[PDB]
């Protein structure tokens, strides 16, 4: 099975620069060339950089203004892209590529890069639990506010992801540069009232790790 | 329509520095015209501010009961008090609501509340001898008591009536209980 | 040294056949090999076909693709289009560079029809502490997309505060949230407030309430 890791991404402010890492395993290395391909909501899907399968040879898109290098690891399975003298315009998902001789046949997961002057902001976390009823249903619905942080992205896991059945991440809304999101988990009103159920929000650009147990509204 | 819309103009929160707080409107008041239009609920009165602001007008006359009126006084005329038609094209408000009363909306089979009969529907006028008239003094009355046994005066279709209650620990919670829940709806 | 242009919207039948095409502006189609990634929302792109006509291993056979050289465009044709085929298609060739088309999004018309679910919290605890109070309101499992989103404070309309996802999907059908910021007096001084989604010529809606049970 193939699997491409990237790492590396983040905030930075214009002017600075990013190296962008692709680990690669589930297929021998040396044998193809790789590259980085980008996207945006407006501008779509864009390629960055090639390089060959020996490394002898390198190949930069157009909008790269040869501010980035590309360059690869055989011994290390892993090859690089240096992001220097980065402007808002690069605010992007990047993604690494294996090639085939004619096409991308296979794509990492895609690392958030946002160059922005505006400072990160961590978000605040708060519980989400029903409001008491006299009523009570066979699976609950819990939740983690995730309020006000910046830049994009956030992840939260249930229960260090131990709870991963019926978690659904919600897109983040945007108001005055600060996004808030909710996650929610659908567990048995069981699982609930037999053992913790915690949300885990990690936002990597402020450091921020937090965990917040859900706990039962009272009277 | 939420059922509380639809009841007297009784005020039970009035927002600092609005068009109500300046004119001197206080919890507690109920507004029974306005220019126009005669106020019998919420709505009509919401209906009534509405229609004055897209008419143009921009001040009118508000009537209101303050407090308890004398046996034999109580049909005695009420003066105008001069208010600012609320600007409802830029969201402006008056600045009253009615905050949840202290009407039962539902009763926990086997609280205390269930035990001595309490019965969705039910006003509760005194907790303790204290009269109320918002949900939030009924809760505050019953978390004062903390274990101690509760009069409640209560009013069912036209009658009053007394209960007397002993609130039941929540071992899940460390806290007391009484078993009531609010009509929101 | 050239662009790749595709429609940027395309809406099919569901079990019908659909063709997106992929036009090349300058050179010919066929000088150079063109291939075809399926992207569904939040996801890597996958390969449909490569090499013109290709099928990798593990794409269904209603998949193809093939050369149009009087219309200077390759085309991705979908037999018997199902829920799941509903993402976006990107083309690709190149030369001397590497060239994407814009991409097309894909609606599969007529799916069973899916009423949203809501789901409401009040504000928490820890953030009433600091005076503040954010109602949520998560919609979840409709289709189709299209839905407003409203709130309503003692039963009416209000704007102020409100901030609401546009519908996203996830599996097979579609999430939003929406959020109402208020004070903690706000929040105390109201009844109840009202999470509203209409969607397909229906209402569905969930109150929250600042009075508690005692």
């Known amino acids: 099975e193939v699997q491409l890791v990237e790492s590396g991404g983040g905030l930075v402010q214009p002017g600075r620069s990013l190296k962008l890492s692709c680990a690669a395993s589930?297929?021998?290395?040396?044998?193809?060339?790789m590259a980085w391909v980008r996207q945006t909501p407006t501008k779509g899907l864009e390629w960055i950089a090639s390089?060959?399968?020996?490394?002898?040879?390198?190949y930069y898109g157009d909008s790269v203004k040869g501010r980035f290098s590309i360059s690869r690891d055989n011994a290390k399975t892993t090859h690089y892209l240096q992001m220097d003298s980065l402007r808002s315009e690069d605010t992007a998902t990047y993604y690494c590529?294996?090639?085939?001789?004619?096409?991308?046949?296979?794509w990492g997961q895609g690392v958030m890069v946002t160059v922005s002057s505006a400072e990160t902001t961590a978000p605040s976390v708060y519980p989400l639990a029903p409001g008491t009823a006299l009523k009570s249903n066979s699976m609950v619905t819990l939740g983690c506010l995730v309020k006000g942080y910046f830049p994009e992205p956030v992840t939260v896991t249930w229960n260090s992801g131990a709870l991963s059945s019926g978690v659904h991440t919600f897109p983040a809304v945007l108001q005055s540069g600060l996004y808030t999101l909710t996650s929610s988990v659908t567990v048995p009103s069981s699982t609930w009232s037999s053992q913790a159920v915690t949300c885990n929000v990690a936002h990597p650009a402020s450091s921020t790790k937090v965990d917040k147990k859900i706990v039962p509204r009272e009277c | 329509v939420p059922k509380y819309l639809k009841e007297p103009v009784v005020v039970g929160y009035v927002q600092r520095d609005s068009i109500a707080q300046k004119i001197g409107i206080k919890p507690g008041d109920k507004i029974i015209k306005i220019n126009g239009y005669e106020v019998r609920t919420w709505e009509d009165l919401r209906d009534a501010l509405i229609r004055l602001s897209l008419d143009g007008v921009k001040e009118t006359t508000l009537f209101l009961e303050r407090g308890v009126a004398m046996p034999g006084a109580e049909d005695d005329v009420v003066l105008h008090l001069t208010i600012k038609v609320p600007n409802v094209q830029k969201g402006e408000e008056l600045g009253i609501a009615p905050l949840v009363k202290p009407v039962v909306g539902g009763v926990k089979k086997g609280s205390p509340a269930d035990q001595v009969g309490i019965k969705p529907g039910d006003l509760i006028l005194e907790v303790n001898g204290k009269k109320i008239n918002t949900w939030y003094e009924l809760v505050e009355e019953v978390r004062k008591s903390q274990g101690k046994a509760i009069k409640l005066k209560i009013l069912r279709n036209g009658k009053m009536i007394e209960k007397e209650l002993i609130p039941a620990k929540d071992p899940k919670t460390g806290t007391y209980f009484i078993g009531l829940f609010p009509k929101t709806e | 040294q050239f662009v790749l242009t595709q429609p940027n919207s395309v809406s099919t039948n569901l079990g019908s056949t659909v063709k997106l095409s992929c036009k090349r502006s300058?050179?010919?189609?066929?000088?150079?090999?063109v291939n075809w990634y399926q992207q569904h929302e939040g996801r890597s792109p996958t390969t449909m076909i490569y090499?013109?006509?290709?099928?990798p291993d593990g794409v269904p056979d209603r998949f193809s693709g093939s050369i149009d050289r009087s219309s200077n465009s390759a085309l991705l044709t979908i037999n018997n289009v199902q829920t799941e085929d509903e993402a976006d298609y990107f083309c690709?060739?190149?030369?001397?560079?590497?060239?994407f088309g814009g991409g097309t999004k894909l609606t599969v018309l007529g799916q069973p029809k899916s009423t949203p679910t809501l789901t409401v919290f009040p504000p928490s605890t820890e953030e009433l502490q600091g005076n503040k109070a954010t109602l949520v309101c998560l919609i979840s499992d409709f289709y189709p997309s299209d839905v407003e989103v409203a709130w309503k404070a003692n039963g009416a309309p209000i704007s102020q505060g409100v901030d609401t996802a546009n519908p996203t999907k996830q599996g097979n059908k579609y999430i939003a949230s929406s959020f109402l910021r208020l004070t903690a007096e706000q929040w105390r001084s109201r009844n109840s407030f009202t999470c509203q989604v209409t969607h397909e010529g229906n209402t569905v809606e969930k109150s929250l309430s600042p009075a508690e049970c005692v």
């Open positions: 590529a294996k090639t085939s001789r004619v096409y991308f046949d296979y």
């Open positions: 589930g297929f021998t290395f040396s044998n193809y060339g």
């Open positions: 390089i060959s399968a020996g490394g002898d040879k390198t």
């Open positions: 300058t050179g010919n189609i066929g000088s150079n090999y």
């Open positions: 090499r013109d006509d290709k099928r």
């Open positions: 690709h060739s190149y030369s001397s560079g590497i060239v």
